[PDB]
Each structure stands twice: as structure tokens, then as C-alpha cells.
Design a protein around this ligand. Structure first.
Ligand SMILES: Cc1oc(-c2ccccc2)nc1CCOc1ccc(C[C@@H]2SC(=O)NC2=O)c2sccc12
Ligand SMILES: Cc1oc(-c2ccccc2)nc1CCOc1ccc(C[C@@H]2SC(=O)NC2=O)c2sccc12
Ligand SMILES: CCCCCCCCC(=O)O
Length: 271
């Protein structure tokens, strides 16, 4: 019935607001500079990156052994820390999806392990436009050109996310749409190694119905938005699997290189 589906949509939106401090709405307000609550420092080359480090307050601190004087590695570490924050936000959010916590714990672990990066890239798009991306909770704005011009493959690290984002962002979802979509991602019955797929697919069937109603009500003029959104899950998968391969190539070209321990656990036996 439609009433239960609407209550689910509201419940998920409420949980998403409690779990994710930086929402798309706040990111869009920052990106549209007519909301001059402040203004992010624009980073576009080495000098501006070094200047931004002076001006931006960083929350996360790499161990001294893993600090690098090299611009591309410091940026890489900035990205990792966004993922370490997001994994914990996503976990809190997942526990509020009805039925998730009653699943076998091993299946909960599997759904998070394989779901977090597809969500991370979904919400990364909320911080991007065709010209660049917000960094450090919106204190800075790193340009896309700059990110393309990084050495070794870090151009291949950034550009596919930008290509995804500008198309994903043309769907014009809001946070109340995204709250349901990321729950659909988590409750994926096709993750490797799942033990009881049927209880997962039964939750996802309910989430898909709530997502379908929500897009119908919230985007009445957007033709086939539901279908187009679900097709983006294919793009998201490709970004993750290509990222995983790319990381297996940086390891060869740097034996000493370091992932945050949380990302080491996520990537371990991932694909
Ligand atoms: C928070 C974090 O981020 C990363 C990481 C991020 C990006 C790439 C690779 C790794 N890993 C950790 C966990 C470990 O974080 C620490 C361990 C130990 C110390 C104390 C001295 S410093 C040193 O180098 N070894 C020590 O015992 C210190 S101090 C500030 C941190 C820290
Ligand atoms: C690009 C950038 O720079 C900074 C920054 C720079 C200096 C200081 C502070 C911040 N902020 C951002 C935005 C965040 O953009 C990302 C977040 C997370 C990921 C995924 C990780 S990175 C990895 O290898 N495994 C993961 O989970 C990836 S990937 C391409 C981008 C990306
Ligand atoms: C690693 C060089 C300095 C930047 C690291 C930024 C991580 C903290 C943050 O802004 O989220």
C-alpha cells in the first residue's frame, strides 16, 4: 500500500539526515556562490594547493611515516579519508534500513563491504560539477583540470568519477531521492558470498517500490527516471571494478605505498 511506502521513504530520509552531515542540498548551496555564507578556496595548481593547505583546516592526520611531500599522494590521502568517514556514516545509515539488522551478521558485513564504494561514488557526485569538486567539507574547491593533470595514473583516478558525476547529476535527484537509492544499493542480492539471498531480495523489493513511488511523486516530468537511475548502478559498478584494478597497478609501481587500514580491510578480497 502507498501509505507504508511513503512512511518508509520518510523514515529513510530522516535516517540519511542523521547519518550524513554533508548533504547534497548543503553541497549545492556551497557550489552556487550566490549563497555567500563563505566561499571555498579554489585549488588549481601546486601553489594554490600549498596555499589551500594553509587556509583549510584538516580534520584527519596521516601517520608521519606515511606523509609524502608529493602533491598527488597528499590528494590521494585526502580522498581516502573521505572514504573512511563515509564508511562509518554508511554503516550507521544501514542499521536503520528496516530488516537489515535482523540479517545474518556475515551477510550484513558482505553487503557493507561491497556496497560502500558504490555509495561513496554516488554521493561524491553530490560534491562535483563539470569544473571541480568540493573538498574538506566544502572549505575548498579543487578544479577538474588540475585533477586531470596528475602524474603516474592519478588522472585515471579522478576523471572517470567526474564523467560519471556530470551525467548522474543531470538526473537532478535530491537527498530524499538519494536516501532510498543508496538503500537499494546496500540491499543487493548479487554480492559475492552471501548466505541467505532471499531475505535480502525481499527487503530490496520493498525498497524498490518505495523508490519508484518517490520518483513518480517527486519528479513527475522526468520520463523513465526510475529506469535511468537503476541503470546508473551499472556505471557505478564499473567505476568500482576499474578502480580496484587500477589500485592493483599502483601497488606494483610503489611497494611501500599505503592505504588507510580501513580501506585495506574493505579492498581485501574485493573482486
Ligand atoms: C589515521 C590514519 O591514517 C592512516 C593512513 C592514511 C592514509 C594513508 C595511509 C595511512 N593510517 C591511520 C592510522 C594510524 O595512524 C597513526 C598511527 C600511529 C601514529 C604515531 C606514530 S607516527 C608514525 O608514523 N608511526 C607512530 O607510531 C600516528 S600520529 C597520527 C596518526 C598516527
Ligand atoms: C579529489 C579530492 O581531494 C580531496 C582532498 C585533497 C586534499 C586535502 C583534502 C581533501 N578531496 C577530494 C574529494 C574526494 O574525492 C574522492 C573521495 C573518495 C574516493 C575513493 C577513495 S580513494 C581510493 O583509492 N579508495 C577510496 O575509497 C575518491 S576516488 C577519486 C576521488 C575520490
Ligand atoms: C595529506 C596532506 C594533507 C591533506 C590530508 C587531508 C585529510 C583531512 C581532510 O581534509 O579530510
Amino acid at each position: 500500500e502507498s501509505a507504508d511506502l511513503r512512511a518508509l521513504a520518510k523514515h529513510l530520509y530522516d535516517s540519511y539526515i542523521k547519518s550524513f552531515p554533508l548533504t547534497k542540498a548543503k553541497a549545492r548551496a556551497i557550489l552556487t556562490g550566490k549563497t555567500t555564507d563563505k566561499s571555498p578556496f579554489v585549488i588549481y595548481d601546486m601553489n594554490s594547493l600549498m596555499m589551500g593547505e594553509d587556509k583549510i583546516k584538516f580534520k584527519h592526520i596521516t601517520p608521519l611515516q606515511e606523509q609524502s611531500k608529493e602533491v598527488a599522494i597528499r590528494i590521494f590521502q585526502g580522498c581516502q579519508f573521505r572514504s573512511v568517514e563515509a564508511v562509518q556514516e554508511i554503516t550507521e545509515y544501514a542499521k536503520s534500513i528496516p530488516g537489515f539488522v535482523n540479517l545474518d551478521l556475515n551477510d550484513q558485513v558482505t553487503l557493507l563491504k561491497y556496497g560502500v564504494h558504490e555509495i561513496i561514488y554516488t554521493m561524491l557526485a553530490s560534491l562535483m560539477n563539470k569544473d571541480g569538486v568540493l573538498i574538506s567539507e566544502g572549505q575548498g574547491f579543487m578544479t577538474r583540470e588540475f585533477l586531470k593533470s596528475l602524474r603516474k595514473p592519478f588522472g585515471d583516478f579522478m576523471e572517470p568519477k567526474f564523467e560519471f558525476a556530470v551525467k548522474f547529476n543531470a538526473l537532478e535527484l535530491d537527498d530524499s531521492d538519494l536516501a532510498i537509492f543508496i538503500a537499494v544499493i546496500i540491499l543487493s542480492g548479487d554480492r559475492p558470498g552471501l548466505l541467505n539471498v532471499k531475505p535480502i531480495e525481499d527487503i530490496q523489493d520493498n525498497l524498490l517500490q518505495a523508490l519508484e513511488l518517490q520518483l513518480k511523486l517527486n519528479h513527475p516530468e522526468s520520463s523513465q527516471l526510475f529506469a535511468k537511475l537503476l541503470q546508473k548502478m551499472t556505471d557505478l559498478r564499473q567505476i568500482v571494478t576499474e578502480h580496484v584494478q587500477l589500485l592493483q597497478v599502483i601497488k606494483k609501481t610503489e611497494t611501500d605505498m599505503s592505504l588507510h587500514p580501513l580501506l585495506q580491510e574493505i579492498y581485501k578480497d574485493l573482486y
